[PDB]
Amino acid sequence: QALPSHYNYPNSLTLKNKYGITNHKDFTNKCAHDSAKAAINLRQEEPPKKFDSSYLKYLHKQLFKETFEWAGHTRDLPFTFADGTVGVMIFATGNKVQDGLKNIDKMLIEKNNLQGLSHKEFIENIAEIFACLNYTHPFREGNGRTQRIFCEKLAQAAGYYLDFSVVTKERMSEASITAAQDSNLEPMKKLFDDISNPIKTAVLKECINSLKNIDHKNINDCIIVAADKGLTYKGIYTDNSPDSIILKTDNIYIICSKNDLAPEQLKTLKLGDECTITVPM
């Protein structure tokens, strides 16, 4: 019998791995390290001429070849381990993996690997590819690390630098869930806009480096987003970093540089108060 359980050690939720490690914490730590060493080397590599699922598979192989026998292989196809057993079987099921990869490949061909596009089209399309990869979940494990590097490389070849380190866990989760369940890509587009705009990335970075907590919660449990030029926000001034105010609105936190606000606007603000901020264009 091919079985999904043949991916794991007997009676365990630990994946079979080239380290022989059954302890889940120890396994996770070692995999994290091996794949982080591979990632740093991949970041420096020349990007490919064409971005497609074969490059995605290459990245997964490079990231996980020291960890998994199946590095570079997709989960829809049975995989035969060296021990003789065969494994099979975050949501596309079966043939849906191949369809998802096909659709991403078609998108990338049609949009010239996202090169030569307007900024708005670059954002709509990289967000859509990230969401499609989410849904496709083509690998047994390591999808997130592989998707991220793929998008980093894609952005690099198009002239942008992506900094995923300014995205909170809560922001990534809510953006991903909303894209998949409500078909709403707006949170994902805003995420990619922030992390590809060096000014917005720096605003978010200074916030993260200054504050462990926002509004009585760990910052990683808060959706924090950069303020956009031209927008008016109304909410509660809940926290203050040296450079920025933090405005709570519709359950999220807008990080607004004090450099973008006028003295008149600044004198107006008191921590805990409701306020209305317009960011100039």
Residue numbers in the entry: 18 to 106, 121 to 312
Show passages lifted from the paper:
Proteins containing a FIC domain catalyze AMPylation and other post-translational modifications (PTMs). Additionally, FIC domains generally contain a β-hairpin between helix α2 and helix α3 that is referred to as the “flap” and mediates docking of a target segment in extended conformation via β-strand augmentation.
Bcl_Bep1 FIC were grown from a solution of 10% w/v PEG 20,000, 20% v/v PEG MME 5500, 0.1 M MOPS/HEPES-Na, pH 7.5, and 0.02 M each of sodium formate, ammonium acetate, trisodium citrate, sodium potassium L-tartrate, and sodium oxamate.
